Design a protein around this ligand. Structure first.
Ligand SMILES: Nc1nc2c(ncn2[C@@H]2O[C@H](COP(=O)(O)OP(=O)(O)O)[C@@H](O)[C@H]2O)c(=O)[nH]1
Ligand SMILES: Nc1nc2c(ncn2[C@@H]2O[C@H](COP(=O)(O)OP(=O)(O)O)[C@@H](O)[C@H]2O)c(=O)[nH]1
Ligand SMILES: [Mg+2]
Ligand SMILES: [Mg+2]
Lengths: 385, 385
């Protein structure tokens, strides 16, 4: 069964955990599986992703045709970090909005971040409908939500909004539980089949390079995505002028392979290239699938003095190291209009211009370092140049 | 969305129609759609399925992932005609068994006809559970159902049995509607999407043969299934010794193609065989996919006077013309013990022995004719010799 990654996003107290509990419980009694209690999910453990600590609960549940890996976090902070660092990626998100209070600041920001980090589909769940009988009222809250989604480029008009009560569903009210089954139905239908990494174009971040007489140059690394097969044309992108060559062998500790697949640590033989022509930070790519760039717009989270970050703010003029895959690249920071200084612990949008071109695309994550110390983490919101 | 064909089957008054209606109601209520009234489904209209007349109600409904075309018949005789003639196609079936009575004569009859006809999957809806309040009874009936299915080679052990109430579901009881959502779940999961005709092994019933000057022998016909391509090898099966040759062209009214596929009326050029080597009744097939036979066990439905069939019954010693694809082949009938007469409008099982071997396999449909007029319709249940 396909595997989809989703999670609940939304303002605090709007019911993200009761809903997550309700979902696992109702799908378990209906389609089979195991229910998770609210307390267990509420008590989220901490995980250290990219030096940052984040509280994240992971649950799993099944619908007759799919398997879901679901994340739920205690606070807004955990969502900002988790989304920017790419700790728990989502093929789709379930926006939980309380019908009693309507959209709030964190609701708008999670939608904001959702777009920036690249969450492709959002399904809305109008929670707490057991407290609101007023049909016209419920409709207003629905209009607000639809337009908020549209502001941030999500198709609010086609967005599936499901009305329900996560508390009553969990409670065991057969009428409300059906609303969960309705939501699960939308998960299965609205969110399309996600692409497996192996289906994505070949991409290998160059880790190290060696040379063998007659056989040529071997560049090693872990295949990020796709598959490289012996005898096919491959490009060396980033750092310098985009080169091109041909794979002539794939090795794995002496063992010769016909191809190298995603997740595998291999060594690829390149015919027509010398070690000297291979700089640090370059990636082997399927011809014409990735391009080097220098300018890009991003979303960044600056660690707090406590997380091991700076104790002092930085200003427009900060020139840090941007660590991409295998190397640091210095660049210049362009802050948002009206921005003054960026305090440790802040998350903002900044336009970066790298000194040397790096093969990148939307969603590429990076760390902002000062010497050896990680000072931030970011994601390429969109390539500018 | 994938399109699957199913239908309800089981003994009278067990709940096939009430279930068919609850499905359209609950699915419409949950995943969107239109409820169909019980009465309209119950009072099935007549359809003239190839001379034959059957009462069949056709309803449609959707789950989040698929669209279903569902048949429900008013009487046992309609299920028999439907299955034998294949007027109604069933990718899967929902066997409805009342918990108050357990398996009855038509339950077993429908399961057997399901076998004989080639109904691949059977889901069980243990209906009327609002009546039976003792668990012990429920388990006993379930076992009996499973045993019975196993008897006819069905995976009694692995068939999903849903316990519910079609009546309570129809009335709008949330608790019992859940069980229909459960049932919809199994349809989505337990029933595989059917094979496309172009995915099955090539088969082309030869309608005529000519010999093109300087090119060779051409056999005309409509590709029943699969694809034929130039350079591919084919076997001419039926009547005599099986021959093998090579397709060196697939013409189509002067236009020369490189392939012929399921559904097209083409001209297959063969290398080697002379016109005089082809016989009526022979099929062109992918090597080793179909063998010629002479003896088989079948299920037949003798048309009635009003259906344009026989106006007089026949007795043992009847030598009818069996029409297989393109020709009539005489055969000798062997009725069951005690059956010493066959009335029109009657269905009967009969072992047949043909005067000449015809390429066939289980589930093959044929017609019984008398001077070009169809007086019967049957299906090869079990190939014997
Ligand atoms: N009445 C009602 N209370 C709800 C509902 N969903 C959640 N709550 C309550 O609202 C509070 C916050 O819920 P919680 O799941 O912790 O929201 P989160 O902050 O988004 O994770 C708790 O008191 C929940 O039981 C609902 O549908 N109806
Ligand atoms: N108690 C009860 N009666 C039911 C249920 N389902 C069907 N029936 C009744 O059994 C009778 C036959 O139902 P029907 O659907 O017409 O049966 P069919 O011959 O299988 O088509 C009708 O009176 C239904 O109302 C059920 O869940 N519970
Ligand atoms: Mg929570
Ligand atoms: Mg009926």
């Amino acid at each position: 069964k396909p595997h989809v990654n989703v999670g609940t996003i939304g303002h605090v107290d709007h019911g993200k955990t009761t809903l997550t509990a309700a979902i696992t419980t109702v799908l378990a009694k209906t389609y089979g599986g195991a229910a998770r209690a609210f307390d267990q999910i509420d008590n989220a453990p901490e995980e250290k992703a990219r030096g940052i600590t984040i509280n994240t609960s992971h649950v799993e549940y099944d619908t007759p045709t799919r398997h879901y890996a679901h994340v739920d976090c205690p606070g807004h902070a955990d969502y900002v970090k988790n989304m920017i660092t790419g700790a728990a990626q989502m093929d789709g998100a379930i926006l939980v909005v309380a019908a009693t209070d309507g959209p709030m600041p964190q609701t708008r920001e999670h939608i904001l971040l959702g777009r920036q980090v690249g969450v492709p589909y959002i399904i809305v769940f109008l929670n707490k409908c057991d407290m609101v009988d007023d049909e016209e009222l419920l409709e207003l809250v629905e209009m607000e939500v639809r337009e908020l989604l549209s502001q941030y480029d999500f198709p609010g008009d086609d967005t599936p909004i499901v009305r329900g009560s996560a508390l009553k569903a969990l409670e065991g009210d057969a009428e409300w539980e059906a609303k969960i089954l309705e939501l699960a139905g939308f998960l299965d239908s609205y969110i399309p089949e996600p692409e497996r990494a192996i289906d994505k174009p070949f991409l290998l971040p160059i880790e190290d390079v060696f040379s063998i007489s007659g056989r040529g140059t071997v560049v090693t690394g872990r295949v990020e995505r796709g598959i490289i097969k012996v005898g096919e044309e491959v490009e060396i992108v980033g750092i310098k002028e985009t080169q091109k060559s041909t794979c002539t062998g794939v090795e794995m500790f002496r063992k010769l392979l016909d191809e190298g697949r995603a997740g595998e640590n291999v060594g690829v033989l390149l015919r027509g290239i010398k070690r000297e022509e291979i700089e640090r930070g370059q990636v082997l790519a399927k011809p014409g699938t990735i391009k080097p760039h220098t300018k890009f717009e991003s979303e960044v989270y600056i660690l707090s003095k406590d997380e091991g970050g700076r104790h002092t703010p930085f200003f427009k003029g900060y020139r840090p190291q941007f660590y991409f895959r295998t190397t640091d690249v210095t660049g210049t920071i362009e802050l948002p209009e009206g921005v003054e200084m960026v305090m440790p612990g802040d998350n903002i949008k900044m336009v970066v211009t790298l000194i040397h071109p790096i093969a990148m695309d939307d969603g590429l994550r990076f760390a902002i370092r000062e010497g050896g110390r990680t000072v931030g983490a970011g994601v390429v919101a969109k390539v500018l140049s």
